[PDB]
Every structure is written in C-alpha cells, then in structure tokens.
Amino acid sequence: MKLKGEAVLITGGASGLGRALVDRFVAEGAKVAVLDKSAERLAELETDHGDNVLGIVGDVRSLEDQKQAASRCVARFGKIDTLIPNAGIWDYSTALVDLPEESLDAAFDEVFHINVKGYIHAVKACLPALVASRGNVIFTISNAGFYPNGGGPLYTAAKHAIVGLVRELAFELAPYVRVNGVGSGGINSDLRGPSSLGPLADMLKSVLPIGRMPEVEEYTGAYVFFATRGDAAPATGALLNYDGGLGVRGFFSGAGGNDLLEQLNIH
Amino acid sequence: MKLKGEAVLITGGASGLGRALVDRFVAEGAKVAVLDKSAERLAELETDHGDNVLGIVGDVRSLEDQKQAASRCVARFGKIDTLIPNAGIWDYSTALVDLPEESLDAAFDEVFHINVKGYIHAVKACLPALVASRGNVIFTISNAGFYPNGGGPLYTAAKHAIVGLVRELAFELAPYVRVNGVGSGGINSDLRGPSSLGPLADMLKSVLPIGRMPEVEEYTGAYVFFATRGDAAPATGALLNYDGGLGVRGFFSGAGGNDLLEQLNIH
Amino acid sequence: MKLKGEAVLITGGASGLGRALVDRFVAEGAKVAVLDKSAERLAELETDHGDNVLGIVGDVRSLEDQKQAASRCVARFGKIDTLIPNAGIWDYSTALVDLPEESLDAAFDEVFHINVKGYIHAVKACLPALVASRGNVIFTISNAGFYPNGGGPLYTAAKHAIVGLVRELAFELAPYVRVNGVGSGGINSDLRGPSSLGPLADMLKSVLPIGRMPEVEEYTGAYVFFATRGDAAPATGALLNYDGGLGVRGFFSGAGGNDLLEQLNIH
Amino acid sequence: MKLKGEAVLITGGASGLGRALVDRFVAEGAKVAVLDKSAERLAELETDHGDNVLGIVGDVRSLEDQKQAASRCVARFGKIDTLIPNAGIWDYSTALVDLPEESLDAAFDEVFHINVKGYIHAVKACLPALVASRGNVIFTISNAGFYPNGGGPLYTAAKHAIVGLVRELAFELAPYVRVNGVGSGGINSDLRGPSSLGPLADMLKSVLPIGRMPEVEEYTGAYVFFATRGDAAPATGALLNYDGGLGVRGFFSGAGGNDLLEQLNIH
C-alpha cells in the first residue's frame, strides 16, 4: 500500500483506463474522488468501493463542475494530493480529407473542449489544494501525443497540446507541484468518438515490439509511480512513453528479436 | 530567384513575420496570395508589390474565407505550390494562476480557434490544389511549441498542438504533399493578445546562445528552403528549431563561449 | 517488497547511485549481484548485506569480467531478471577548447570505453539469461544524455550514445527483454574524472524547478518501477527525465511559481 | 551562387554524400577543401574541379591529419567558413546477438574512432579558424541518430552520440560558431562496414512516406541552407530530420495518402 492516506482526484474515472486507475489507487490505500458525466457508471463505482471513493457527476468542460469536484474532495478527504486529468474522446482516426466541411468547426470544439480545456480546468480548479499539499498532476496523454496514426489531425493535435501543458505547467507550478504525463497505449475501453461526427488487439500485435496489447490494469503502475512522493520527487516535466514500444518499432517488423530463443538455443 | 513561377499562399501575411515572408517570397520570384483580416495592411502590401501579390480580406477561423483565398489564388496564379499557415495571437504569457475564471472559456476558444483551427482550415481549403501541384505546407510554430516560458498554458499548448499537426499531416498527405514546421523565435512584430483577456531584444539577449535577437528578415530563409522542391524533397515531418538556440542554452549563461576570442588569442 | 525473489545485476554498484540502488533493491526483496572494480568497496557492501548481495571484482571494459559476473549471478541466484549497467566516469565538463591535443585520443577512449562499451558488454554478457527470464535492462543515462552543460563534448556525446542504445536494443531484444533508460540528475557521489585528463547542491538549486538537489536515495524509485514486471510491462524504449526538471526550467528562473503561496494566500 | 567566396572543409568528401556536397558547394561558388583517406578518389575530384577544390590525403582519426587539412585550407583559401564533418563507416546492421565476442572490442573502436572521434577532431582542428570567421559546423548524422533499425547497436549509438555533439558544441561555441546536424537518409553510396567485422531503394520505398529513396544530390540542399549566414543565423543546435519521413511513417503503411488523387478526383 504505497499511497495510504493519500487523496486522489481522477477525471473520467468511471470507465476504461480511468476506472482501472480508481481500482489501483484504492488498492494502494488512497481515497479517490471521481468527476465523470455518467451518473450510472459512478453509481457502480460507489457500489464497488463504498466510502473509499467519492463520485461527482459533472462535465470536465465546466469549470464550475470541476471546482465542485475539488471542493467536495477536500471536504471529504481533507486534501488533494494527486490530480489525474484523464477524461477524453477520440476522433476515430478521421483523416483530414474525410472530415466533413459542415461539421469541422463543431468537431474541433468537441475534441478540444473535452481533451484540452478539460485538462486545464481540472488544474485551475485544484490549484490551491495541490499547492497546499505539495502535490502532483499526472496527465493521461497517449501515443497520439507523440507519433502519427493514433488518431486524425484533431485527436493528434489535441494530445500533442497536452505535452505543452506538461512542460509549461511543470515550470509554472514548480517548486510546489510536480507535473508529469503518461503516454499510454491502446486499451480495450469504451472510448467514444465525437457526437459532432456522428481487433485493436489483433491489428496492433504485429506492430508492437512487446507483441501483445496490454490489459487495462497493466497501465496503472506508471501513475502510482508518479504519485509516490518518495519515488518520484526528481520527476517533473517528464513524459513517459508507455504504449508497448510503438516509438522503437522496426521498419519491417514490430520486434527485431522474435527469433532470439532459437538464435540462443533456449527452450 | 529560387522560386520563380511558384505560387504561395500565406495566412496572416499583412504584418510581422508574415509580411517579411511575403517580401522574401516575392524577391525569390514567387507570386503570393495573402489571407489577412486587416484590410488596411493588405492595401499597403498591394501598393508595395502590385500584381506579384493578391490580398484576400478574411478570417482564418472561417473555412469559407479560407476556401475563398484558395480559389482566388488558383484563379489568379493557376495553382498553389506552397501553403504557409502563419496567423496567430499570443496569450501574453498569462500564467495559469493569473488566468481569470470568468474568461478562461472564452480565451481558450480565441487562442485555439485562431492558432490551431485556423491552421487546420488552411490545409483543408488548399488540399485539392496542394495535391495537384505536389506542393508543401510550412507551419509557423515558435519556441513555444517546444519549450516552456514562451507563453502561458494556452499559447504553449496551442503551439505544441501544431507539432502534432506536422506529424499527422506529414503522414496523411504523403506521398503528395510535404508538411514541415518552423520553430521561429522572438520577433519585433505587432503580435497581439486575446481580446477575451483584454525589451524583447534586451531581455532575451542574455539567454540566447547567438547573443542577439534576430531581425524579422533573418527568419525567412528556412521557409524558402522548405518550399524549394530541389532542396527539400527528403524533408517531410521535419521540425526545425530556429530561435537563436534557446534549446541549447546553458544553465548559468546563454552562450558558453563568450570568452573564445581571448582564449584563442584572436583579435 | 515489490521485487521478492528477483535477481538483479548492477555494474558500478559499490558506490554513489549504484550503491543506493543495491540498498533499495535489497530492501525490495531482490538478490543483487554487483560488478565493480573496487575490491574494498565491494567488501563493505558484502559486510552490510551478507548473502543478499554478491560482489564480483572486475572491469566493465572487459567482456570476460562481465561474463564472469553474469555466470556467477546465475549460479548463485539462479537467473538474472534485471540488468542495470550504471558504471561511468565524468569528464569534469572540460570544454572542447580546454581539451589538450596530446591526450584527446586517450581521453576519448577512457570515457567511451567505460561509459558506452561497458554498457554494451553488460548486455552482451547477460543476454542469454535476460532472454530466459523475459527480463529487462535499465541504463543509467543522466541529464547529459539530453541537454548540454552537463559535461564537455566527451561525456555529453557518450551519454547521448546511450539513448541510441535504449532505442536500438529495445527494438532488437523485443519481445523478450524490455530496455529503458533513466535520465538521473546531479548526485553527491564520488564520481571521478578521466585518468587521461589527470557546491553541486548550492550551484544547481537556482536552476532546478524543484528548488533542491535530490538525495541519492530519491533516484532509486524509477529503477524499481522499470524492474517491476507488473507495473512496467508496456514500457520499452522509454526515456524518463528524472533530474529535478532541468528540461522544463525557465529562461530567467528555474521555477516559475516561487510566489504561489503568496499569490494564493496559503500559509 | 549563394556561397560565393566562402571556404568549406568537408571530411570524407571524395565519395557518396561527401562528393555530392563538394559538387553542390562548388556550384554555389564556394572553394572546398577535402580530407579523405582515398588518394585515388581525391585525384578524381581534383581532375573534375581543378583549383576550386583542395585534396588532403589523411585519416579523420588523426588529429595531426585534421590539423594539416585545416592549415592547408586556410593557407589556400584564406579562411574556413563552414566545416562539414561527414566521414563515416556503417556496421552493416549487425545486431547485438550477432556481434562476435572476439572482435567486439575492435569493432567498437573502429566504429567510434571514425564516426565520433573523427567528428570531434575536425572541430578541434578547425576551431581557431571557425571562431575567426564566425563560421558554422554541419554534422552529417543520419536516421540512425534518431530511430532504431538504421544500424546495429554500434552505429546507432555512434550516430546518437553526434546529437550530443550538436547540442554541447552549439552551447560551447556560441556566440561565435553555429553548430547544426543533418539527419540524412539512405543513399546509394559506397558506404563500407568495419574491417574488424570483415535494393536499399526497393526495400525502403514501402516504408518511406515520400515513396521513393532520394538521389544523393537531393540531400545537399540542407547543408547549403545551414552554411548560408543570411538564411540560417537563428539556427544553432538544430537537428533537421531529412530522410524521407521515416519518423512520421504510419503503422501499417509508410504513407497514409496513397489514394489522395482518387479520393479528391484529380487526374
């Protein structure tokens, strides 16, 4: 239990990676406040964890919902140690040529309001509390914040924008708050596309050096690491690629050592 | 005259770096179409260059103004070889803690609609023409797309977003259109801040390795290079840091060799 | 005890960061084999940890000493799960202009043989064992592998070379062995300079965003993370900057939020 | 003729990319001194260019040969404006598992002495002249200095080491000398492998976004750009990826827009 007594606020924690994070942080001894728009999924979370979790129904695009989540977390758990802005929506890799002219403006706002402005509002709302606890922020980025072909122009630009948030907020909030970003890979979640615009495992296993798409729980360890003051004190402004090795894949094969057992005579 | 007969479309070309680019590209033999919201400054440009330039008054946030600029450029000059999305607004380095809650939503849209959506709309509007000419796109980024302290969270995230546009559009438009980004530094322009939120040379000379802030005309050579098919054919998805060396400055001094003349006995 | 029953081989583990790593990994339940040239310091380590550690006196530049360390680790502890090539020497930030012509060749070999070839030999020697255990390699890099002014040309080029080892070996050894690199910062160790060429805390606290130079034990958490199969399975080819935020420091100040308590009225 | 009256020194200029560079720089009006070990190829160069070129037979691993090249260039052409360290040898992508134990030490020195130490010696020898002319250094790197699978561990680590030279020497030689690096791609040259260890176009066209391997002359434009004081004054410490887009290639296809003509109805 590395995070006993710590309080953590997670946006988009009712499903997918966010939900795995709530489960992992509770197992590490933390209390977790979650801001999510789905009342039903938040109810499930409260059923499973009881008073180890606090559900706040609200939209990340709303600074007022964000401030309500922060004040309720402070009221219930006394502080906010770690903030994990994670809620997001994908653009279903719609290429530029396939983005319809009539909804490009609306899709731009949907994607950027959720994925980028929602991240800024979480930090703005929790700032006073994070400074008081000398806490930290861990942004969920994705391989889309580093390499192409993880989404179309909208999602790729929005996730690259979060790299800029990591660097600029690591500078601005130092020396009180540490700010780091996790470049997580593909997950079998319920990630939705933009309303404005109306397999993963098998496709990707040939391009990932690790040779398999990780389960959603295998992506929680990096967040625990960055949230641990005793292990991550020198980490601020860090960007951890954590997607199975997409950035080091080969030209013609994902992995270059599929034949290592045979080459070294291991059995 | 490296670009004789080439046609170039520049957004935000009526002032500052954009205007220097128009002057340089005309001097290289190109015809230049400019999309800018300032009627008055566009008039000045037309006075100076005559029919080597074409002024289109319009907003980069409007896909219809962008499409009007592209069709007028094609009508007048027959094609579009190079597109340079460059219009932008700064956030006056307003830190997160100083961004007022009541105008954060509006400032987010002003900054992102101009600096990011305006860049996407320029490419969307000029796509058919760029594919026909096997042309290229050169985005104006800034040191703010790479390092902190070049603006607050809004401008730093928006310029980092353009790095994502470079990578994703270089992939998507290959092999027909090359897409590259220029990380230009500080200029003595008329760069304005957000309406929503209501020296440079002397401050920065101690932190720049080159020891002086470059004149606006010294930043035009990199664009000419990327627009030259005979010199930049292997360049796609490239990001050129071009800001005086901010990224390689030292810990305690901008430059590490201020004493080299004395150390080597040069006079 | 996150690494109970794991076996770890550390080069240069008798002093400084290496020694802190041995202490931390033993505390996490691992058995640790150490390859170091100092017989005396290895004796101290064996005194402190008894049969939780194994000392092998040898030079990292010698492939035969490296192979002896690997076979002794396998003989004693049955396997090798994690390999941490860490031994190194600094160049005392001797700039290019100050490197004497008469010893430049010798200094080049001393620095590169230890810091780079020593890392390749450790992986070559432990390869068969790492493939059998599906283990991982964690290279100690430094801020010198990312930014200037952490050493002169020799040390900066040698540490940047290790970034190339991370990427190329992450590709080549996948999908069996994960390869990651830690960009650790300044430590109060006994790091020596090159024989060929014959404060830290107080100097650096004004340039580090965290505002203090971390103790040597605060740099061990990132290695434990990467060595934990249950937390770092998606991490291969990763480079973690872990130096107090040097890469996100400001232009005129290390940290941009020294006044946050006063600005937010915290007491 | 962008470089009339400029003097340029190129190492490894008698063949492949180096030779194309000599041809291009002479065509731009420069005088070029070349340091190469091949007497025969240097003779050919002198036959083709006459007294626009100066051939110095010598080894880049020898600081004395390097100093002889620099003093002869200064004697003949009066100065040294641009220095282009370019000589190199490949490792034939020999993976770590295939590197023989008995020649690993010798191969390490052959590769690093030529590719890395040869680059340091060129700058050391030409330093006084570069400071006097406020000149610049352009290192030939390669895609191997950025991504895996461009060579084995030795060549990939050596080319990544040159990125460290770019950053550290850009800092140390500022504000007098600009230092930049070109990440050139695959060429149909006579690049040899290590003596110690005893198609390209067709293989790579499916992974390059541009869809073809560039001719050797198409890689010379970036060097001319960086050597032009009037166009590259703000460029120092820059790293230009220039390899056909390897870094932005897709997961399943090199280019993502092979069908753009059909999708946009162009003919």
Ligand SMILES: NC(=O)c1ccc[n+]([C@@H]2O[C@H](COP(=O)([O-])OP(=O)(O)OC[C@H]3O[C@@H](n4cnc5c(N)ncnc54)[C@H](O)[C@@H]3O)[C@@H](O)[C@H]2O)c1
């Ligand atoms: N699934 C993938 O392949 C993947 C890959 C990489 C990175 N990511 C990123 O991981 C993060 C989590 O995505 P996920 O896969 O877990 O998706 P998910 O859809 O399962 O989870 C998103 C959660 O955010 C909540 N949410 C969505 N919009 C909201 C809004 N406006 N206000 C409040 N809550 C809102 C949803 O209700 C949901 O509970 C996102 O940032 C996503 O971009 C996902």
Ligand SMILES: NC(=O)c1ccc[n+]([C@@H]2O[C@H](COP(=O)([O-])OP(=O)(O)OC[C@H]3O[C@@H](n4cnc5c(N)ncnc54)[C@H](O)[C@@H]3O)[C@@H](O)[C@H]2O)c1
């Ligand atoms: N000035 C600097 O220090 C600096 C530094 C780095 C990068 N940049 C970038 O360089 C680019 C040019 O900025 P600049 O310094 O030349 O500024 P500038 O203000 O002089 O030029 C901006 C031009 O864009 C036009 N413009 C602004 N908003 C518009 C809109 N909505 N629609 C159409 N046209 C619009 C303006 O009328 C003006 O002519 C921008 O992307 C900016 O972010 C500037």
Ligand SMILES: NC(=O)c1ccc[n+]([C@@H]2O[C@H](COP(=O)([O-])OP(=O)(O)OC[C@H]3O[C@@H](n4cnc5c(N)ncnc54)[C@H](O)[C@@H]3O)[C@@H](O)[C@H]2O)c1
């Ligand atoms: N001290 C710093 O500021 C610092 C900063 C960043 C990164 N680093 C890196 O951390 C790693 C550890 O350095 P440190 O500070 O702990 O230094 P240190 O001198 O205290 O430890 C180096 C250890 O390596 C052993 N060693 C040296 N040469 C050897 C050889 N040829 N063969 C076998 N063993 C040998 C030494 O005997 C010693 O026990 C190195 O890679 C160094 O580059 C150090």
Ligand SMILES: NC(=O)c1ccc[n+]([C@@H]2O[C@H](COP(=O)([O-])OP(=O)(O)OC[C@H]3O[C@@H](n4cnc5c(N)ncnc54)[C@H](O)[C@@H]3O)[C@@H](O)[C@H]2O)c1
């Ligand atoms: N060919 C490729 O695919 C390729 C790809 C990317 C980068 N590069 C790089 O481009 C640069 C030029 O390589 P190239 O393709 O033109 O190869 P090349 O073999 O045709 O040219 C190398 C030149 O260097 C000279 N040389 C070699 N060792 C020398 C030494 N010890 N002293 C003096 N001169 C020496 C050779 O005689 C030759 O004239 C190298 O740095 C190489 O790493 C090559």
